A paper describes a structure:
To understand how TCRs 12-6, 38-10, and 1a2 discriminate between wild-type and mutant p53 epitopes with exquisite specificity, we determined the structures of the 12-6–p53R175H–HLA-A2, 38-10–p53R175H–HLA-A2, and 1a2–p53R175H–HLA-A2 complexes to 2.61, 2.46, and 3.00 Å resolution, respectively. Kinetic parameters (on- and off-rates) for the binding of TCR 12-6 to p53R175H–HLA-A2 were kon = 2.5 × 104 M−1 s−1 and koff = 0.032 s−1, corresponding to a KD of 1.3 μM, which is in close agreement with the KD from equilibrium analysis (1.1 μM). The complexes also differ with respect to incident angle, which corresponds to the degree of tilt of TCR over pMHC: 20° for 12-6, 27° for 38-10, and 1° for 1a2. Hence, Vα dominates the interactions of 12-6 with MHC (72 of 92 contacts; 78%), with CDR2α accounting for more of the binding interface than any other CDR. Residues Ser52α and Ser53α of CDR2α form a dense network of four hydrogen bonds with Glu154H of the HLA-A2 α2 helix. By contrast, interactions with the HLA-A2 α1 helix are almost entirely somatically-encoded, with Trp98β of CDR3β mediating 15 hydrophobic contacts with Ala69H, Gln72H and Thr73H, and Gly94α and Gln96α of CDR3α forming hydrogen bonds with the R65H side chain. The TCRs discriminate between mutant and wild-type p53 by minimizing interactions with the central and N-terminal portions of p53R175H, which are structurally identical in the wild-type peptide. Interactions between 12-6 and the p53R175H peptide are mediated almost exclusively by CDR3β, whereas 38-10 and 1a2 employ both CDR3α and CDRβ for peptide recognition. Each TCR provides close contacts that tightly sandwich the imidazole between Val76H and a specific CDR3 side chain: CDR3β Gln99 in 12-6, CDR3α Tyr103 in 38-10, and CDR3β Gln97 in 1a2. Further selectivity for the mutant p53 peptide arises from hydrogen bonds with the P8 His side chain: 12-6 Glu95β Oε2–Nδ1 P8 His, 12-6 Trp98β Νε1–Nε2 P8 His, 38-10 Tyr31β OH–Nδ1 P8 His, and 1a2 Ser98α Oγ–Nε2 P8 His.
Several TCRs have been isolated from TILs of epithelial cancer patients that recognize a neoepitope corresponding to residues 168–176 of p53R175H. This neoepitope includes the arginine-to-histidine mutation at position 175 (HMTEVVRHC). The TCRs are restricted by the common MHC class I allele HLA-A*02:01. The structures reveal how oligoclonal TCRs 12-6, 38-10, and 1a2 discriminate between wild-type and mutated p53, and demonstrate that there are multiple distinct solutions to recognizing the p53R175H neoepitope with sufficient affinity to mediate tumor cell killing.
Numbering used by the authors:
A (entry chain B): 1 to 100
B (entry chain P): 1 to 9
C (entry chain D): 2 to 121, 123 to 124, 132 to 176, 185 to 200
D (entry chain A): 2 to 274
E (entry chain E): 2 to 245
Amino acid sequence: MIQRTPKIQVYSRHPAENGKSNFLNCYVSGFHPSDIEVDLLKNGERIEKVEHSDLSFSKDWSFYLLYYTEFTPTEKDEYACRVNHVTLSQPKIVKWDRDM
Amino acid sequence: HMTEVVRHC
Amino acid sequence: KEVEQDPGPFNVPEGATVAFNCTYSNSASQSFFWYRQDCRKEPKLLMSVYSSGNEDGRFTAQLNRASQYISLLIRDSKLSDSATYLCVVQPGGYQKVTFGTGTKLQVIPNIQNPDPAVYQRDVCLFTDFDSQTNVSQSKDSDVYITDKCVLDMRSMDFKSNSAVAWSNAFNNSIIPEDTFFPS
Amino acid sequence: SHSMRYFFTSVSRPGRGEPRFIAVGYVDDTQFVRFDSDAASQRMEPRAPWIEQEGPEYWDGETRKVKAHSQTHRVDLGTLRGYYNQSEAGSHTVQRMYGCDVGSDWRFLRGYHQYAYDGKDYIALKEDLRSWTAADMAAQTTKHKWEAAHVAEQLRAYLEGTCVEWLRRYLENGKETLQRTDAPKTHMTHHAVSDHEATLRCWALSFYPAEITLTWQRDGEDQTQDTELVETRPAGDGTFQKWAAVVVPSGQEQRYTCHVQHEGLPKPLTLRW
Amino acid sequence: AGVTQTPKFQVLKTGQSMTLQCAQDMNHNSMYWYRQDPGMGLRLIYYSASEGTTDKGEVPNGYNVSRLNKREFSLRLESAAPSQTSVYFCASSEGLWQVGDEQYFGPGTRLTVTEDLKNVFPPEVAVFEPSEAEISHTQKATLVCLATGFYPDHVELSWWVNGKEVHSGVCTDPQPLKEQPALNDSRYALSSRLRVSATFWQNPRNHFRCQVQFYGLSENDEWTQDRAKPVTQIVSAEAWGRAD
C-alpha cells in the first residue's frame, strides 16, 4: 500500500472582519489512508462544535475533508488547525494567518 | 440515481 | 407471478431447432437466467441472459427490455435436452429472485424402421412403434399401463419406444393397424 | 458542461466491527446525497434542497442500492485480501468512482467506472465501455469474472441511459443553483519577504464551478519560474477559492500580471499591483 | 464440491417433527430454502442473505431456519402436516446484493408425511423374461422389471449386467405411478425395461439384475406391527440367459 501526507489549509469562509460572524475552515487533502485527526484551536484549546464534510477522494485516489465551525475573530484570538495522520511522526499545527 | 451494476471482484 | 412461461410440453424432433420464451411484468428487472431441471432432479444454471444475444454453442439467449421478454434457442437438439427450462429473474440488488413454473421440452427420435408389436414371461410389452403413436391409460381400474419410454442401444446405434401393461391391453390406445400380435 | 459522480470508500477495520463505508454523490461540484455506515439512519440522506423533493420510492431504492454497494465492498475486502495473501489484521481500503459527463447539449459524452485497492488503480472500465484495464495479475482474475458476467455491457447501459436521464432530471430540478456560474472576486496582496523581495498573492474568491486557472506572467512570458499554487479549496458557501504567489524583486511588481480564467468570466482577467 | 443437503428422502407421521440440513463450501454469503410442487414453481420458504441474518420468504408458515454459520443452514419442521409433503431444495449464492447472482442448488429432499407409519411398504420386485416372439422377429430381447406396492414413492431402480450397472439399453418410467389413483395414501408402481442382442440374452453365462433402492424407516423409527419393518433396503430380482 501507498501512504500520502495531508496538505493542510486554514482560512475563513469570508474575509476576516472582527466581531462579525464568519466560519473558520480547515481543509486537508491529498492524504491516504483516510483515518485522520483534525482539531481546530482557539488560543490552543480544541473547539467542541466542529463539523466536517463527508469523506471524498480525487482523481489520484487520495482523500480530502473540510472541518469547520462558526466563529468571530478579534485580532486578539489566535486560531490554528492540529492534524494527526499515520504519515506524521508528530501532530501538525498550522496557524491561521489573515493575509496568506 | 445509482446503478444496480455491482459485482463481486 | 413476476414471470410467465407456457408449460407445454413441446415435442421437437431430434435435430430440429426449438424456441422458448418468457415474459415479465416489471420493466425495472435487471438480471435474467435460464435454468434446466431433469425429472426428479435439482435446477441447474444453463446461462444468463443479456440484451446482447449470447450465442454459446447450440444455445442462444435473448433479452428484450423494450418488449419484456427473454428467449432461449436450441439448435441441433439432443435426446439429452429433454427437461424443464426455467426463466429466472433477479429484479435487482437485494430483491427476491422468482422462478418460472417452467416449460417442459421433449426431444423425439425418428424411428427409421417402425415394427409395431405386442409381446408377452413370468406383462404385455407394446414396442417398436413410430414416434407419432401415443399410449393412453386403460378404462379398467385393475389395468396398469405406463407411457412411451425411449431406449438407446448406443452400440447398435438403434432406438426404440416401449410401453408396459400389466394385471391384450391397448384397445383404448390408437395403435397402428399393422401391429404384430403373435401367439 | 455537466456530470454526475458517485464516490464510494470502504475501510476494513479488523477486530472493530464491520468495515467503514462512506458514499457521496455529486452533480458537478455540488454534493446532493450521502451515506455513512457509522451514522444513525442507515439510509441515503439528502445533502442539497432540490433532492428533498424525491418520493419514498426514490429513497427506498437509493438506500437498497447503496446497501448493495456496501455488501459488495464488504465481500471485496475478503477476496482482495485473499488475492494478495495479506493478513486478517491489517486495515485496507477499497474505492469506487463512477459517473457520466454531458455537453452543453445535455447528451452523453463519456462514462467511467474506476476501482482502487489501498489507493492504487486496480481495475477500470475503458472508454469504449466494453473492456477492462486490469493493472495487476490479481486484477486479471477480477476481469475474467466481470467478463463472464457481462458487467461492462450492463454498465454501458446504465452509463449511456439512466445515468444521464437522471443527471438531466437533476439539472432541471436544481436550476436556481446548479445552472449558476459565479465569477471569482479577485484581488491582490503584497508582502515584504526579504529586504529586496515581495510576494504577490493573486486571490480568486467565491466562484463556482471549481475549475479555474491562475497563471503569472513576467512581461507577457508565462512565469512558472517562481509560482506557488495551492489546491482549489471549498469555502463552505457552496463556493470555491484559490490563490497563486510569485516572489518578485521589490520595485518590479509592475511587470507582473495575474491571469484568471473561469467559466464565469467573459474574457480572461488581468490584475496588476 | 458445492451445495450438500441431507437427507435425500424422508417419511414422517402427521405431527412428527424433523430438520433438514444443508451446507456449502463455495464460501457463499446468501443461502435459501425452497419447496417444489407440481403446477407452481419453486416457492422460497426462508432465506439467509448473510451469516448474521435470516428472513421469511413466501411460505414460512410451518417452518423455521437457523443460519448455523457461513457454511450451513437448516430448516426445521415443528409438527409435520400432510400438506408439507413436497420436494425441498437448499441453494446458495455469492450474494443477493450483486447483479447476476447465480444460485447453486442442492440435490433436494423428497418428503412424505402420512396419516400413519403403517402405510409405508417396500417394493415387491419382479423381473420378466423376454418374449419368445420378440427374439423371433427382431433378433433383440427386452427384460421388463416391475417394482410394485411401495409407499412412499422414494426409489432408485437400476439394471445390473454381470454385476456392472448398465445405462445403455434401458428405459425407466420418468416417475412412479399411483396404483390406487383415488386413495390419499396410495401405494406406487414403477416399470423399467432392458434390451440386448438375441445372442447376448441366449448366452447362459450372462447375469441380469433389476436392483431397486427403497428409502423407508430409520434405525430409530419405531416399528411395532407384525410384518417386516419397512426400513431403507434393497429389493432385487434376477434372471439368467435361457434358450428354450
